[PDB]
Structures are given as structure tokens and as C-alpha cells.
């Protein structure tokens, strides 16, 4: 699509005496990790998605806390590849919306409201307990007796 769009823009500029503004303003999901982080702290992003399977967890441990500090809707979504397929990449580990058409505003608002009740509310309480209290089946059976 980029090739056709570039050809159309070049034609409209060279022969159409346009000013490169003929093409409509685009709408796409912002996905760059550095780009997404920079978009945050400016309160421009409307929604943020986080992949939980990031092997270098340090890359994304701070993102939920930073989003909570900035009060931006953030969601942890299973699978980094699913985000990649959504963005025409192998993996992205992050996804965020910046500009959305008015038609999808209501659905976006409902999704943001649901996400806030899913993750944002639990932020204040999830930070004060420790997981990983699981044991093997054999050990559990032996100790239960």
C-alpha cells in the first residue's frame, strides 16, 4: 500500500499542484517501545498494551508503573507475537493507540473503562503481596499427609 500511496502523492504534487496535504490524515497503532514510552509522559496515547512473555522482563517492568503514574490506560496482553501480527511485525512487545476515528470512540471508551477496572484498580493492591507459593505434586502430596 505504501508504494501506491507514494505514487499517488507524487502525482498529485507534481501534476496536481497540491501541497502534500491531499492524502488523508492516517490512523494507526503506535508500537515502537521507545516510541511508545516517549508518547507516554506526554499523555497523548489513549491505550497501551503490554506483552507478558518478554524474556528480558526489565524492558517492560517499569512500563505499568510509569503508565499508572501518568494515569494512562495500560493493559497486559498475553503473547508478544499477537501484537506483532496486529502490526505486521514478528514481535513488538507493545501496542498503543494515539488517534482514533469518532466512530470507534464509544467502543474505545468502553474498553478503556473495562481495562481500568481490570488493571489500574488492582495496581494499588497487587504491589503488596508475593506470588510463587507453589510446590510440586509429589511434595504437596507428601506434606499434606
Amino acid at each position: 500500500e505504501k508504494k501506491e500511496r507514494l505514487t499517488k502523492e507524487a502525482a498529485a504534487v507534481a501534476e496536481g499542484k497540491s501541497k502534500q496535504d491531499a492524502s488523508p490524515k492516517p490512523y494507526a497503532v503506535k508500537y515502537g517501545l521507545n516510541h511508545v514510552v516517549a508518547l507516554i509522559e506526554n499523555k497523548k496515547a489513549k491505550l497501551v498494551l503490554i506483552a507478558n512473555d518478554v524474556d528480558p522482563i526489565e524492558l517492560v517492568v517499569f512500563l505499568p508503573a510509569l503508565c499508572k503514574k501518568m494515569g494512562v490506560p495500560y493493559a497486559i496482553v498475553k503473547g508478544k507475537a499477537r501484537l506483532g501480527t496486529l502490526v505486521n511485525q514478528k514481535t513488538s512487545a507493545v501496542a498503543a493507540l494515539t488517534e482514533v476515528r469518532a466512530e470507534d470512540e464509544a467502543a474505545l471508551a468502553k474498553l478503556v473503562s473495562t481495562i481500568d477496572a481490570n488493571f489500574a484498580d488492582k495496581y494499588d493492591e497487587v504491589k503488596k503481596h508475593w506470588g510463587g507459593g507453589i510446590l510440586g505434586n509429589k511434595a504437596q502430596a507428601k506434606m499434606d499427609k
Binding site: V37, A38, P56, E58, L59, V61
Partner: protein, 203 residues
Amino acid sequence: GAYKYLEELQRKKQSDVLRFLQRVRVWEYRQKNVIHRAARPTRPDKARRLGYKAKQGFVIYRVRVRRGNRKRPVPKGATYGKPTNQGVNELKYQRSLRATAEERVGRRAANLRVLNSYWVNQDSTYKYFEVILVDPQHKAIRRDARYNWICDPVHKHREARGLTATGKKSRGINKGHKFNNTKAGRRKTWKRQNTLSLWRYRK
């Protein structure tokens, strides 16, 4: 972006968040071989500032190297000399473990040039480092003015000659009066200062 979050967080090595990750990763590396290739750098912030670029021609390798003093390679520690030279257990191996790891990975990666390395973990019996290497055979590196300089043969086995960041530190290559004995080469300086200059017209 995430540059400062990664860098500052890595500095809090004593934090509970980093303690669990270190405990998991040291065991994970122990379950692996002494030398193995890391698919992607575990510390992008550290590697990125060391000159690493996420493109074809850059390779990340992980190596495990033992720690402690170096035992003299003699039978029963007998140095067969003056009493002062009989010390064996206290030999300190004046080359840092990072340099040894870089040399070992370069030997295993002779076709790649050791660019730099950074610490990633430690253990009571072993130490862990991550080495960034550049392939001069790749046309991308050769065609890139920012990295084609390493393609020159003068850079062959940089880690072996102590031309790396850690190697230069071990050589004491720094400006100022504190590094006079090694400002411009310890052996070269010793040879120059011990030379008996005699011009045609003796002064």
C-alpha cells in the same frame, strides 16, 4: 524512551526485583555450556551504548569464566628459586577475568572481532560476561562507514592485544602523572628510558 529506565534499574542490583532475576539467570546459565551464543542481548541499554547495533553483522556471545587467584603452573608449588618467589597461592593473575573471557570468546569466535563486553552475572565459583562481536565479512559492516574501520587487519584480535576497554584498563593506558610507568607502554617506556643515546658529536 526506556533507555534511562533500563540503565537506572540495572544499577539497583541489590533490589528484590533484580535479585530474583539474577538468581534465576545464574542458574539458567549454569545449566548451559561454558561458552554459548546469546540470541539477543539481555541488556539492550548496556550493549547499545557500547556500539552494538540491531542489524546483521553483530553477534552476542555468553561465556562463563572461573574466578579467584591463579595457581602457578609448577609441580607442588616449588618455584626453585629465592624464598620471595616461592609464593604460589597469592598470585593474583594481573589480567582481569573480563579480558580472559573476551580472549576465550574471540578464540572460539576467531572470525569475529571482539568489540566490547559487559558484566551480566556473577557466581561464587564462576563469573558471567556478555561480549559484543562484529563480523567484518558481512557487506553491511564493510559498507557502513561507522563500522568498516574494524575491517582493517590492524584490528585483528583486538582482545588479544589488550586494545579493548577492559584490556586498556588492565594496561593502565591513561593520561596524567599517575600513569607515567604506563602512559605510553610499560615495556616501550622501560626500553626508551634505559636506552643509552650517543650522537655523532658526543655531548
